[model samples]
Target: STGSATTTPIDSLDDAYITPVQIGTPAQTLNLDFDTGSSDLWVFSSETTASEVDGQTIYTPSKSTTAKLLSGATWSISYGDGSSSSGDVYTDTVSVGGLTVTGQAVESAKKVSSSFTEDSTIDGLLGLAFSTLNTVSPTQQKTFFDNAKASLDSPVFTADLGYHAPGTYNFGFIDTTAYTGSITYTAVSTKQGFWEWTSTGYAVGSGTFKSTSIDGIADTGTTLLYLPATVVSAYWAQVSGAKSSSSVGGYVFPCSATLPSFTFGVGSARIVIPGDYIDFGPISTGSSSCFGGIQSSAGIGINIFGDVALKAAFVVFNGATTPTLGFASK
Candidate 1:
């Protein structure tokens, strides 16, 4: 079997991508962020604190005839940005696109951070990373993809994230028409439970590609691309009036600065990210200084090839025993 779902950018900055998901027997639909950076399918639900609820569509497990409480099970998770959520667990019928997974563990959020409450467009998160990262305690649960892998035509899923347009997430099979050129596959390290791979190197605009091994994760959940400080500094140096600002918290440049494209290597293949996509947007409304879409991952310890990089290519997350990642130009 196979499944396909359309994922739309939530804002002008393309900060996050959201896909509609059906939960419960009655099929309450909610928009969820398909996050490849983490594992734990959680949602805002009736169990959430009333004060924390905003305009999000909450999942009501009580209303689902097929919902079954997992006694003594609970989960809690925190993101790189420090935002977090925690709650009890319930097994219910969950559907993404047309793929159905019965008895899927759904973490109902009892408490959520203010950041989640303010984001009205995102109702919850659907983690697509390896199940090893699942936060469920006592009994670790498999991810939706993991649970559905056996029944799928192929144990693979693909992400075709867009710059400012709608994209797709396909389970079980790769859409041959979704990309151009041959795909470049690389070994994935699941030691940290992420879709981590080593990028061959990168180039600033039309410059020569540097030969360096940059290890990073393909994280669709994150908004920007994060690389080593040296790489980030090199890219920013090419832009006039660009500087790393301590107060603004990252490299920022004049809004009118002429930006250059960024290119990264995937084996022998090269994927280019247009300069326009790198101009994240003004630091503030009406501000003349704009933040960069690519930042340094110095303090974070690990580099991240987030949506900024993922959107530049068609990515395949193969879930086979010896997992591998495939990247193709689109």
Candidate 2:
């Protein structure tokens, strides 16, 4: 009898997590992350009898009181994280934040790399972020939206990230007050997750950069924002000792005291970049290490928007609704 929270938490549920739901009598549940970077509902199960697959929950279809694995077939997923898992795919009853659907497609890894072996604090990932990025086959791609679109009380679903709070991902139609009205529209072009738009440059206080323009893909998959080196240096110069603390390791930083507020214009909507996200986090010498969320991973394909950027406003994953993408909204 799970109460208010529509989804249940697995033993290892930290970071941004969601629960798997199985419809019908005594629905089975699992903890997961709503990963837009990849697709398919993959979980670690004891069923996977492989050395590579460690620290993952193996869903046993036969043992489940109401669920079924997808015939225990082989499946695997490789990510930018340089870690991966390969195992058998299964289908069984599954559930989400607060809905129930049956005949859902799910994956189980046969072999997972050492890095894949995370502590109990991390469970699995739910790829509702995009369809193309989905690791599950096109036909097999089953996101929560797949079921909610037809069954959710409201045709739309919303994701209320904890604003930094762990496991605060609310799903199924965004009715939160933080989310304003009538989302802005922008046509998305599928050229990998790294999409971009033209921008003259960035501005700080009573200043502005050149009109050369910046290009990037607005991603919900990423937590921080990445900008070019020129933009990062120029913006920080105006401030007091906002120099790069690029000395530390693993993407981190040191505060110089007073922080400055910056802003960017997505057409007419001007998005602000708080100082905590700007001059903080990991920093290094290379242009790639200039900005925190707006790092300098230009050619490395290292650019991604981490939590620092997404928390400020409400985000919409359109792929579940229409075209299929992690589209950004004001």
Candidate 3:
């Protein structure tokens, strides 16, 4: 064992105010999909094999001071695709664009074998939907929004993710930009943590289903514009030469064919579904990648509005100031 010697710096200043705000750079950035349903952040590491696509951003511990590991706290995430991966517990530090928060807990996937690891654009995922569904037991339930809410200098935080474009997400503490008064509120429910609910039984196009009740949620974690089978079937009926294709998971129409407008209802909120968010992927071979904006969540249960449906509107999540939240539009 070697002996150690310590020396104190001579010039010391008293009463130094330490401001704990940090501005993160894109170089030290990790582009990720944000989800509200889970509290942990999952990212692929350099140890990941080349079979996985080159990630959007790489995390380096040297760049961050707050990054740490909650040893023995192991984790694994399973997708609907049956792909799963597990890794050690590391307190991954990140700055989502400009909104920065320290001491944020994240699930660092050191041994990744998931399809997400194969995406060149997808580096990791940031869960922002709701803390109720966090995979952490005994609930370490700390979401990115929840961590930043206290430091944010505003009443609400709004996320504007341009869904048509890849990795186009913008965050601001107060989204008073392009909004008016008189916002609507949806009653929250405790189910699978998707803010689920049943509509007064409605169907679209030539839709057929065992149940007419459609459940929907505002998901920050999911990039797809998910909908019920009834909506997809009825919408497809009007498509020219629409046929069932298991490879795509949903009924497929000619990619070149003109399709009808499909939309979802959130009380009085009529969300317009973008054309690209759906149809491009999973339905056709050699099609556009993953349809990063929209896909089928029918059998999976529940409807979700992606960033496209969320555009042209400013949603205020009052998870900090109040028990409930209100929505506003520009």
**How much lDDT does candidate 2 score?**
0.50
Tens digits of per-residue lDDT for model 3, 1-330: 111111111111100011111223323555555554445576665434446645445555445566665656766666544666555555644465456666666665666665666555556666765666566543354677667666666534454443332222334445345456556565556557554544434333334323345666666554455666555555566666776667655455665665444555445654444454444443335753232233467676667654444543455455543334445444
What is the Å distance of residue 135 in model 1 from its true position?
A: 0.6
Q: Tens digits of per-residue lDDT for model 1 on 1-330?
A: 999999999999998999999999899999999999999999999999999999999999989999999999999999999899999999998888899999899999999999999999999999999999999998999899999999999999999999899999999999999999999999999999999999999999999999899999999999999999999999999998999999999999999997999999999889999998898889999999999999999999999999999999999999999999999999
Candidate 3, residue 307: Cα displacement in angstroms equals 4.6
| Superior by TM-score: candidate 1 or candidate 3 | 1
Best by lDDT: 1
TM-score of each: 0.99, 0.72, 0.72
**What are the runs in model 2 whose C-alpha is more than 4 Å off?**
1-25, 48-58, 69-73, 137-140, 153-155, 166-172, 180-182, 191-215, 218-221, 235-252, 256-258, 278-291, 320-330
Give the alpha carbon lDDT tens digit for every residue of 131-225 in model 2: 45556543445565554456655444444343334323444454445455445444444556333343334566556534454555544445455
